[PDB]
């Protein structure tokens, strides 16, 4: 997967943060390896890259090695959103600015 520089520090057992709560969670007993390398030349353009997305809002954290692709409108208040953006109604996934 592609990630925002700093984030790398999150991909590790016991770490928290957005990526380590709503997008990709590692079990505490994980064994294996992790390879990470910068790709500013390819994955980033001066013309703007926006095909990479990351989820921002979720009701509950993920179990280890879990995947979520639901695109329903997030509810932040008591009133339902009815699939329409607005107050307390934000799209769960944001975008990634690469320049």
């Amino acid at each position: 997967f592609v990630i925002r520089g700093d984030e790398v520090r999150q991909i590790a057992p016991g770490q928290t943060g957005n990526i380590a709560d709503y997008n990709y969670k590692l079990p505490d007993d994980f064994t294996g390896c992790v390879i990470a390398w910068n790709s500013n030349k390819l994955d980033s353009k001066v013309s703007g890259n926006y095909n990479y997305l990351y989820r921002l809002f979720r009701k509950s954290n993920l179990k280890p090695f879990e995947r979520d692709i639901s695109t329903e409108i997030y509810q932040a208040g008591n009133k339902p959103c009815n699939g329409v953006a607005g107050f307390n109604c934000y799209f769960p996934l944001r975008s990634y600015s690469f320049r």
Epitope: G5, D6, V8, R9
Partner: nanobody
Framework: SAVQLQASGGGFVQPGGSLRLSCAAS????????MGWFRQAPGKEREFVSA????????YYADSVKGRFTISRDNSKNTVYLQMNSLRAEDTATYYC????????????????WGQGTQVTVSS
């Protein structure tokens, strides 16, 4: 881990001037850690000068060079740069770029790797 450090810069300068040093890193290490410079005066001991995190968030400088030396990072070459001015006679020494392989820096005692000595000389 296997990390190689390539140092560049140094020479003879006039007091109070500015010069050029830069260190590049290659290979593979455990994590994205700190990087700093170490000064060795002739006949003296080897002491640190500063230390910068990889992501250029927090900077650490020695009390003897604060407000006079600075260190920044490249955006497309993975090479750390540093600038200095108002150089004085005591600055004639050998400098080494060093890589610290941990996320959070506590003290400068444990040093992982060392680079080739870059001798800088200042005089009239």
């Amino acid at each position: 881990s296997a990390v190689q450090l390539q140092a560049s810069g140094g020479g003879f300068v006039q007091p109070g001037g500015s010069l050029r040093l830069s260190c590049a890193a290659s290979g593979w290490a455990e994590t994205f850690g700190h990087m700093g410079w170490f000064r060795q005066a002739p006949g003296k001991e080897r002491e640190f000068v500063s230390a910068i995190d990889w992501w250029d968030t927090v900077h650490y400088y020695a009390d003897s060079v604060k407000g006079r030396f600075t260190i920044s990072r490249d955006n497309s070459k993975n090479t750390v740069y540093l600038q200095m001015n108002s150089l004085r006679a005591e600055d004639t020494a050998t400098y080494y770029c060093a890589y610290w392989d941990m996320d959070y820096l506590q003290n400068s005692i444990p040093v992982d790797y060392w680079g080739q000595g870059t001798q800088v000389t200042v005089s009239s």
